[PDB]
Amino acid sequence: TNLCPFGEVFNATRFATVYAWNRKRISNCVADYSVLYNSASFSTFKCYGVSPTKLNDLCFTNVYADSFVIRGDEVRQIAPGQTGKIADYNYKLPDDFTGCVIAWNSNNLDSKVGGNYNYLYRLFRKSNLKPFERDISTEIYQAGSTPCNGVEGFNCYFPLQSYGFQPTNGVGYQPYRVVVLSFELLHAPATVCGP
């Protein structure tokens, strides 16, 4: 039985940055969410629509896996119909979203002594962000009436800032590994099914 490669998702060596979230395609395999639910190794497990108890006997067409690591207090900004800096400039979810969001504490992996200048996030955007949109542009954001000319200065700010992860931070200011699964059904025959 070709089990879906969930292990390489949850237990990957490194995860993606907030602004540049990696998308993985899941198809032509069989999954088992009962073990995922009963593991109880995730701090946060909430979602709407489909139920974890009845998720086993459900057939879909494509499953999307997304990876990004944010702070503890931001996990509530990955809910449908939510507004925040993440939901406006980094990662927006549609109102009619279906799927589930998984979050667990990860202090022991991404926190280093003296600071961790490896993870970043989008600071400013010219406008709002379309749902399921990704932006990699590093152009200097402009919040005034003068052209930036590609050089940092007055009213010309870098759109990206680095986190300051450190093992001495607070409970809600600690790294959190978050993966969200998207389930879609199309007019094509279903391929992803349960055991």
Epitope: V75, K85, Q161, G164, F165, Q166, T168, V171
Partner: antibody
Framework: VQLKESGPGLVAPSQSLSITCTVS????????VNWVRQPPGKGLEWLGM???????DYNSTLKSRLSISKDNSKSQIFLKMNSLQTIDDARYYC????????????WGQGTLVTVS | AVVTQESALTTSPGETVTLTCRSS?????????VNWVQEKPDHLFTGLIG???SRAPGVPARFSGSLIGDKAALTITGAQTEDEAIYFC?????????FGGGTKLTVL
């Protein structure tokens, strides 16, 4: 968003203190609440902290006396003190945080507590 | 931990002023998570900047903060007649938030 708290005002020394902070048109859920006090004629003074998940982080020199609890359903934050000192008079605020990586954003009007 | 701020600065409308927040425990880093709050008469408080640069969408664009050297600073561009206040910087040191002494700002 508005924040309101009720304080006894005048309490005898070496007596318990209980301050409740209420929220209007909002929900506690995963939002932290900080307690900050300011004695008259001086600057601000940190007291404690409660996180969204229920964990707490108190002032080092006041952990023996302080105690913070909150109720999600009734939407209130509680502050408890014991063995009050004459110096322990100030204006007490309950401070909330917004969803733009900025803490100490929403404040209250401030309740005044005097001990004598 | 001990943090210090300037006592007071004089400002006229039109130009820019930088208000710093210095920590005596060492050089301020990104991990300090400096926040800024505002004082208004009748004891009115308002938060402006979190994470040292995360401006709120409702806060006017004239308020901006960053790190310069070993001290975190707040920059106001084009001060108005409504910008008189007292500003406090909050730092995350050890396991308890640390407030500053306050900086009174006067507009001419």
């Amino acid at each position: 968003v508005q924040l309101k708290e009720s304080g006894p005002g005048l309490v005898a020394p070496s007596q318990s203190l209980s301050i409740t902070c209420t929220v209007s048109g909002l929900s506690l859920i995963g939002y932290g609440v900080n307690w900050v006090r300011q004695p008259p004629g001086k600057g601000l003074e940190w007291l404690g902290m409660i996180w969204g998940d229920g964990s707490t982080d108190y002032n080092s020199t006041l952990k023996s006396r302080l105690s913070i609890s909150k109720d999600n359903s009734k939407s209130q934050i509680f502050l408890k003190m014991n063995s009050l000192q004459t110096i322990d008079d100030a204006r007490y605020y309950c401070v909330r945080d917004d969803d733009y990586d900025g803490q100490f954003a929403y404040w209250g009007q401030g309740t005044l507590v005097t001990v004598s | 931990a001990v943090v210090t701020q300037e006592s007071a600065l004089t400002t006229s409308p039109g130009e820019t002023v930088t208000l710093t927040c210095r920590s005596s425990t060492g050089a301020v880093t990104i991990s300090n998570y400096v926040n800024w709050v505002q004082e208004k008469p009748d004891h009115l408080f308002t938060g402006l900047i979190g994470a040292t640069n995360s401006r709120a969408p409702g806060v006017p664009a004239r308020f901006s903060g960053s790190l310069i050297g070993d001290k975190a600073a707040l920059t106001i561009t084009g001060a108005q007649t409504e910008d008189e206040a007292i500003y406090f910087c909050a730092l995350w040191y050890s396991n308890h938030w640390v407030f500053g002494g306050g900086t009174k700002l006067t507009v001419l």
